[PDB]
Enzyme design. Structure first.
Site, mmCIF file in Angstrom:
data_model
loop_
_atom_site.group_PDB
_atom_site.id
_atom_site.type_symbol
_atom_site.label_atom_id
_atom_site.label_comp_id
_atom_site.label_asym_id
_atom_site.label_seq_id
_atom_site.Cartn_x
_atom_site.Cartn_y
_atom_site.Cartn_z
ATOM 1 N N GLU A 35 0.768 -1.204 -0.043
ATOM 2 C CA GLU A 35 0.060 -0.371 -0.074
ATOM 3 C C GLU A 35 0.919 1.229 0.107
ATOM 4 O OE1 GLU A 35 -3.095 0.242 -0.754
ATOM 5 O OE2 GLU A 35 -3.931 -1.485 -0.155
ATOM 6 N N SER A 50 -11.800 10.608 -4.029
ATOM 7 C CA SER A 50 -11.341 10.215 -2.653
ATOM 8 C C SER A 50 -9.825 10.252 -2.706
ATOM 9 C CB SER A 50 -12.095 9.176 -2.156
ATOM 10 O OG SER A 50 -11.448 7.878 -2.863
ATOM 11 N N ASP A 52 -6.606 8.158 -0.682
ATOM 12 C CA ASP A 52 -5.951 7.195 0.392
ATOM 13 C C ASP A 52 -4.817 7.835 1.252
ATOM 14 O OD1 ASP A 52 -7.776 5.109 -0.750
ATOM 15 O OD2 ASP A 52 -5.911 4.482 -2.319
#
Length: 129
Positions: A35, A50, A52
């Site tokens: 990630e 959006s 992250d």
């Protein structure tokens, strides 16, 4: 902060992720590797508008407030910037909610695509835990 692998394993264990919702520590370390590359400051915008945030790339549509993700929720009740701290407490607390939401760690698509079904204990090899 860019964590080392064993450094992050120790922090994640201290904060209660080892075996949380049945996911061993190596699953969590593997997820963070793919990630964020272990970088707490990582951010990445998504097509839906959006973003992250942080070591586990927690998304602003559902989980945190960034002020620019319309008609979003803040189910972790934090500002997204809290997820970028060198202190992973807020990211861990929010990850515990996410992994409890019904799909387990499949909520992290890097986990599904790069960690699920693999030898995830490799990620904690050599660490003094």
């Amino acid at each position: 902060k860019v964590f080392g692998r064993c450094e992050l394993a120790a922090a994640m264990k201290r904060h209660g992720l080892d075996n949380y919702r049945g996911y061993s520590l190596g699953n969590w370390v593997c997820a963070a590797k793919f990630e964020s590359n272990f970088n707490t400051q990582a951010t990445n915008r998504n097509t839906d508008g959006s973003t992250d945030y942080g070591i586990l790339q927690i998304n602003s549509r559902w989980w945190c407030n960034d002020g620019r993700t319309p008609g979003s929720r803040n189910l972790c009740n934090i500002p997204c910037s809290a997820l970028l701290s060198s202190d992973i407490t807020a990211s861990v607390n929010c990850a515990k909610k996410i992994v409890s939401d019904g799909n387990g760690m499949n909520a992290w698509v890097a986990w599904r695509n790069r960690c699920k079904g693999t030898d995830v204990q490799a990620w904690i090899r050599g660490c003094r835990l």
